[PDB]
């Protein structure tokens, strides 16, 4: 719920997956 | 998936592989979205075409997994369910409009590095997200090719789809409570859904608050992969009213 | 295909 949406492995240790910035890159 | 990658460990920890008991076998992809709730394609438990009706006792949940066919001991967490709620106006006659289902969870699973739910859209970051041109990612354990299976969960991120250039693509009749991914022929680049994957999540990270959100479902396409085709997705923040209406009547 | 799953999942 309140914790929604955000990965122990990733968000949670501020890690970023190898391609989400191409994700990033498509919201102009 | 299609042209897709192997998934980094805990990338996708709401990610559901939905197991028939017998013959033990891949159904499905879902997602986790709440300790007792998980989210899938309607057609998934029932399609009469195909002689697909399954009922509760038929299927197992399998959580927290990577590898498709090894049983991840210590790692994957495996559920009974409760109850299947299908959409009342599913159409499975037609074009598979409202392809969505809630599937209620025996007890609650345990949270973990490897498990853990999606958030769900609102109306505010749907609006923002929900532009063509921008990427989604779409995860599965389905078919490596249209015409073969992966090792491990496979990840592939596709740009959302003008309307027009959907509905042009196809001659099935679309409707609002879908939208379509994928490259067109002229990008170069490409990847698809396939078999297997169906009722996995399509999921954007808002930019706005760094979370994860699911804003499709994978549903149908016109094989996998080909040129001039895109993937079709259930519109779940248009439908997430009736995904509160059952969360609050039988939560 | 499949690797057995524990039979408790199954009674
Ligand atoms: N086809 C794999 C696929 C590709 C992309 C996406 Cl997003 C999901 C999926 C998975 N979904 C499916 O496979 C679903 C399950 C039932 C029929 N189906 C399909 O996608 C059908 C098309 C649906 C459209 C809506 C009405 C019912 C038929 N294509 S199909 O299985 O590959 C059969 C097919 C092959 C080649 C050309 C045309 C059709
Ligand atoms: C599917 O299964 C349920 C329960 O057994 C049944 O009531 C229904 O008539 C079947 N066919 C459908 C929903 O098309
Ligand atoms: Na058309
Ligand atoms: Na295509």
């Known amino acids: 719920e309140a914790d929604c949406g ?15 910035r191409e994700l990033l890159e498509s919201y102009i | ?55 509760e006792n038929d299927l197992l949940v399998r959580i927290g997994k990577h ?12 559920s009974m369910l409760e109850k299947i709620y299908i959409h009342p106006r599913y159409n499975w006659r037609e074009n598979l409009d409202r392809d969505i ?13 490897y498990i853990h739910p999606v958030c769900l859209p609102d109306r505010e970051t749907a609006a923002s997200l929900l532009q063509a041109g921008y990427k989604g990612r779409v995860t599965g354990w389905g078919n490596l090719k249209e015409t073969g299976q992966p090792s491990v969960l496979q990840v592939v991120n596709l740009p959302i789809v003008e309307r027009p250039v959907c509905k042009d693509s196809t001659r099935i009749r679309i409707t609002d409570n879908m939208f379509c991914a ?9 990847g698809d859904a396939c078999e297997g994957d169906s009722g996995g999540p399509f999921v954007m990270k808002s930019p706005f608050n760094n979370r994860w959100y699911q804003m499709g479902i994978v549903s149908w396409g016109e094989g996998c992969d080909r040129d001039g085709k895109y993937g079709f997705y259930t519109h779940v923040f248009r439908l997430k009213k009736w995904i509160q209406k059952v969360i609050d009547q039988f939560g | 295909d499949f690797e057995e799953i524990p039979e408790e999942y199954l009674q």
């Not at chain 2, 289902?101 to 590095?113: G, I, Q």
């Not at chain 2, 994928?182 to 490409?190: A, L, Q």
Request: one cysteine or more.
């Open chain 2, 101 to 113: 289902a809630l599937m209620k969870l025996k007890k609650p699973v345990a949270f973990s590095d």
């Open chain 2, 67 to 78: 590898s498709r066919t090894r049983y991840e001991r210590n790692i994957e967490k495996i």
């Open chain 2, 182 to 190: 994928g490259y067109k022929p002229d990008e170069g680049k490409r």
């Open chain 1, 6 to 20: 955000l990965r122990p492995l990733f968000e949670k240790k501020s890690l970023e997956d190898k391609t989400e």
């Open chain 2, 1 to 55: 998936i299609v042209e897709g990658s192997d998934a980094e460990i805990g990338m996708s920890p709401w990610q559901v592989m939905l197991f028939r008991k017998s013959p033990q076998e891949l159904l499905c992809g879902a997602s986790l979205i709440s300790d007792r709730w998980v989210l899938t394609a309607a057609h998934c438990l029932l399609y009469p075409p195909w002689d697909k009706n399954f009922t």
